[PDB]
Symmetry: D2
Amino acid sequence: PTPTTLTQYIIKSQPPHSRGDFTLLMMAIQTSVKVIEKNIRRAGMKGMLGYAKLDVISNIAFKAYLLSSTSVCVLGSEEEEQMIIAESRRGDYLIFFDPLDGSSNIDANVSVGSIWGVWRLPKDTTINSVEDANAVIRMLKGTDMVSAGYAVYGSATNLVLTSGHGVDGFTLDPNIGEFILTHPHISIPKKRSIYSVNEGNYGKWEPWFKEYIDYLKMNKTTRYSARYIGSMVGDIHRTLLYGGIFCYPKDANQVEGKLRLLYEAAPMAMIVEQAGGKAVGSNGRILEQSITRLHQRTPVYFGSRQEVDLCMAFRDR
Amino acid sequence: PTPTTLTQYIIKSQPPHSRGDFTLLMMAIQTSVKVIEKNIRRAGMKGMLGYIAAKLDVISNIAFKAYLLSSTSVCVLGSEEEEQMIIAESGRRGDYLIFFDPLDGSSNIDANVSVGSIWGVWRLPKDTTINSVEDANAVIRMLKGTDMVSAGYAVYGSATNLVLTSGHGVDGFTLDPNIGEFILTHPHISIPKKRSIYSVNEGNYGKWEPWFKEYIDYLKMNKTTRYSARYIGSMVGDIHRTLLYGGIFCYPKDANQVEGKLRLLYEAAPMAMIVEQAGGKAVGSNGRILEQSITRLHQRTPVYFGSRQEVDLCMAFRDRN
Amino acid sequence: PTPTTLTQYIIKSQPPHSRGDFTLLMMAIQTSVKVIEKNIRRAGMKGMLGYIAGAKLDVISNIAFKAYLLSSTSVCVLGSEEEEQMIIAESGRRGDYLIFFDPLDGSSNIDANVSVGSIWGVWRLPKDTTINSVEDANAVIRMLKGTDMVSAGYAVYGSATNLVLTSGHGVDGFTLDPNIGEFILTHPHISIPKKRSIYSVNEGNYGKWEPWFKEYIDYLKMNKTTRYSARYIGSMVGDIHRTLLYGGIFCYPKDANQVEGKLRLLYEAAPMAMIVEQAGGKAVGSNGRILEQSITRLHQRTPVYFGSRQEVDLCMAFRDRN
Amino acid sequence: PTPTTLTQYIIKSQPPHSRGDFTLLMMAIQTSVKVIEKNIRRAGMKGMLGYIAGAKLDVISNIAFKAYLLSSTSVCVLGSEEEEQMIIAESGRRGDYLIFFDPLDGSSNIDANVSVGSIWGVWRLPKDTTINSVEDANAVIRMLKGTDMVSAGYAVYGSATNLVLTSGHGVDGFTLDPNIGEFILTHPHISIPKKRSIYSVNEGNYGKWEPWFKEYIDYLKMNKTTRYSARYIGSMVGDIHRTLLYGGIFCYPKDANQVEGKLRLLYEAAPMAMIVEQAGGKAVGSNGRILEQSITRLHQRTPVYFGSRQEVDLCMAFRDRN
Ligand SMILES: Nc1ncnc2c1ncn2[C@@H]1O[C@H](COP(=O)(O)O)[C@@H](O)[C@H]1O
Ligand SMILES: Nc1ncnc2c1ncn2[C@@H]1O[C@H](COP(=O)(O)O)[C@@H](O)[C@H]1O
Ligand SMILES: Nc1ncnc2c1ncn2[C@@H]1O[C@H](COP(=O)(O)O)[C@@H](O)[C@H]1O
Ligand SMILES: Nc1ncnc2c1ncn2[C@@H]1O[C@H](COP(=O)(O)O)[C@@H](O)[C@H]1O
Ligand SMILES: O=P(O)(O)OC[C@H]1O[C@](O)(CO)[C@@H](O)[C@@H]1O
Ligand SMILES: O=P(O)(O)OC[C@H]1O[C@](O)(CO)[C@@H](O)[C@@H]1O
Ligand SMILES: O=P(O)(O)OC[C@H]1O[C@](O)(CO)[C@@H](O)[C@@H]1O
Ligand SMILES: O=P(O)(O)OC[C@H]1O[C@](O)(CO)[C@@H](O)[C@@H]1O
Ligand SMILES: [Cl-]
Ligand SMILES: [Cl-]
């Protein structure tokens, strides 16, 4: 009859006898994304009246709206060294986010994004200090994650999220400023001949991965196409809709990869898994890895299940 | 005092004793870009009215043609998508030929990542006129990229940027969506002489010429300089990054694409003019793209565009084999 | 920390152990208002694509409002002022809310593109009653009063877009921020001043008014104590919105041709009365509070005297002393 | 083929062998109007960024209008209605155009966010004259008449944004398309109807009017031939804009407290008179055409009787027969 907005979708997804905290958290996130997108679309130009980096603005916006929701006890921005504990205005959700992913693409104004992961406090635990929070993040796994999403700020703005019952994607309609459901129940194809990785680091890769990449180029069965925007959110978003593989492997300088576990990889892993893909690191599922440090890094091999299997076959043989 | 709009810039760039036709052509192009950008930002969603009761390629092409044909300044239009040129009806006929790709990076449309529009403007050679496609075919064959009066692109990314040149450098403008004006944000764009970024589809490695394979391996394996790779998959996106950051963009020959992929009139020549005007090099199979002769309308060419020293390194591998 | 959006406000207002139907109804209304506002701001111009390939705003507004309300699953009955009959929602998609609305108030101001609006009132089904037909609905509206109304609101499409609503705990006003397309709380707990020297009525109908009202209007002009200013936009939503924020009085009285006034009870007057009362003003008709009047017909008319409590008292003093 | 933008219209209207200064002035005005409209649509809310880190609309509008006009290099003299003095442009950046404007007309309607506007009139320096000081400018405005005016326009910030202008060859109206931020020609060659039964005036001042005008207003109400409708938004730009498209009359007459009326001659009345006259209406003051009156003071007031030619004739008939 009329198309479904993100606002409707969030409210209609609320199970009976919920507090409404999670719903208010999603509303806060949605509003952040709009504010952040508006500043990005302006490329940070001042208004014509009155004749601030976009990282800084995005981070300020995301924090402000999440702290105003009363649903969080802990915030973690990838940029900042410490977590923020909400005063005690304190729910039981921990949010970890990267507010402006693909920061090297900002000056060219190509695709960039935001990523977030939401965890709930384990039962019979509470956080009054950073030292409590440090203890708590160490006992969390990606499989205990209640929600994940990203926003891609591209030629259009897309918001893609999951609560553990599949993945739904929404496109911002700028006439009325609402996110409209355009990609329901996203299902990443089981195979697709596209790969996404920075081959500038070829010389520093492990031999098994070098062999993998050479096979993609030299094999006689299947021609592969290469794409690498340089923003994880941009590349993953293409990977979800088109199929393929996204890789950021180990290298001589980055022994545990580049991407952060809490802030980027675990959230994206949940989305990719919920869309029917695989999402692995050094040893199986990213969602099963233990958090030891807050800023822990991990390699990633995310995408179409058969494309990730091929990749791991090179590592296993 | 106040920032310069594209509209001001175009009018203030008009040389004394011009007809004003070129100015009206730029205004028409500017308006097209705004209309196209708006449909792209909506990802082609119908209005909420339309849902109770069209590909982006098709819409972009319709928009670009309509505004250019309304300007009274063109005699010939060429859209990359279409097989033939369109001759304007006489009565509404200037002496400009426009060749354009209205939606570059069409494989990126469904993901809604960066895409673009590209155009090149030529003037009729003195003592010539076009009444038919056969006249137009004769005329394009006597044109070179060095006779081009104007070139530009629009990048539809996280912001919308319009970058253009009239032969006196390159200026870039960012769309301010509050007031719908293009504001001068990148005056006199100067592409760095070197930068360690390269842009090419390495999925085609196996089908490349050995000299280019060696080039790419050197970028990866050499011990002096670490290179970063970027390839969005839209020429306008990749070139725009190349102009502001420096680096190199390559679409070389391969076994299946013997003369490369990118069209000479519609894409490569216009981009070559922009890159050259910003201080970079822009070469094909044998020197400057702007010096190549148009034989066919849909003629292809390889491209090696970017920072001068990065394009020199690339050609050094071809010259030493 | 950050300013409150309408979306937050609606969710945070949800009492514990509600079904969430009312919340979904407000979201549907909010979305309608944005869609309607966008078409109004364009003055109904086709897109630049629509022009090369080559709908009244009343029709579009009505289509939008109905579509979003019927998609919410919370209504059983819709009533648009324009249409002769009520619409009963198909069972399967049927809550227990009745919405009566005027989707584009001030229709004579459309061509000039000055202030126009939308108005709605929300009622709940009386306990142990249900509607399967227009004949059931007709029975049910007759047993409703304005005092049984669970919610009322309007949207003003002016130089800015404002949405003003109440659920029986005061009146809050929100301004559309067009950058991000959210309604932001700008006028919390609206309190209409007890007096203000502004009056709003169509004096083109002076000759057809009752003598007591003629005397009232002459007093406003001729008295020696207090100079009054006149304002009449011609859209009830525009005039009432000014009245709420500035104070004053809005009148549409009886006349020779309009014996029971012009404005409809269910669609316009009762919803506005609830808002005005919740903001501290008075809102009366032929005989006391509009909210106490009985609905006899669906399209029943009533005179209105809405506004600042002391300005409405002065007005009624002229009627009571004759 | 495609619809005409204001930008196209301005350039195509440029006569052969013009300097282009006037064209640049119109572009500057157009851009001002968009900037002003955007701040008005936000009701002056700070951005959501501005709120975490923690300006009247009259002040912002005035700053915007001045900045864009001073950046055009085409003006020597600016006059904002709000300010007491004229601004002389610094020499080096000095054309021969004098602009007089009211950047935010209808200031009493700002808080309610109903219709408001901007008005401007453009004059050219008389041949063999120049301005180096306010004292030169004062001499020059005294020798100007409304008939020497090269251009006039207004912007109405209503439910949509309309820009209406004239260069002495009729009146054309443009509606802002907010998708692409361009003014699109929607009302070409505006022709105000010769008669229409609508009148616009503040009847709150009835008691202080001259007897002839009281008789006029009573005739509109009491006569047996023609029923009149009353409309008064309270913003001259809003009321006039309705008058141009619908027909009728707008009046701000003399009163006991305002012996020469309220509206300023240079800033409001003369510009509107030019527009109304160019659309086929009449626009008179105390003694014939407003455009023929002599400027004695900068802030000189005048009564106005603007609108449909037969409606203004009826009005003046009451003054001529007493
Ligand atoms: N809008 C929603 N969409 C999906 N799941 C939800 C929603 N609201 C609540 N839930 C689920 O119910 C849990 C508890 O909700 P709450 O009591 O609101 O914190 C959340 O952690 C979610 O797993
Ligand atoms: N607005 C402008 N900006 C830059 N160059 C222009 C402009 N207008 C005219 N020209 C140059 O002058 C030539 C003739 O202009 P016209 O007579 O308007 O077609 C064009 O081919 C351009 O090279
Ligand atoms: N978001 C809300 N704001 C104010 N009142 C509400 C809200 N939600 C529910 N209510 C009140 O509770 C009643 C029943 O709610 P429901 O069970 O959702 O139909 C409504 O008729 C309202 O009076
Ligand atoms: N774009 C235009 N539209 C209408 N009239 C114009 C335009 N440009 C110039 N004129 C007329 O020509 C006169 C001188 O123009 P200028 O030489 O630009 O100062 C102006 O006062 C106008 O009457
Ligand atoms: O410059 P590199 O090493 O390709 O890294 C790009 C990566 O960095 C990030 O910006 C994270 O820091 C990701 O968005 C992206 O995948
Ligand atoms: O898919 P491929 O072969 O890498 O081609 C991408 C190229 O094709 C184009 O879309 C032109 O057809 C360019 O925008 C881009 O550089
Ligand atoms: O033109 P009139 O008779 O003064 O009526 C105007 C009234 O009509 C309405 O449009 C309702 O029909 C109201 O918005 C407004 O108060
Ligand atoms: O409040 P009053 O006396 O009706 O005056 C309103 C008039 O004042 C103005 O704001 C000019 O000061 C006009 O827009 C309007 O016609
Ligand atoms: Cl991109
Ligand atoms: Cl209004």
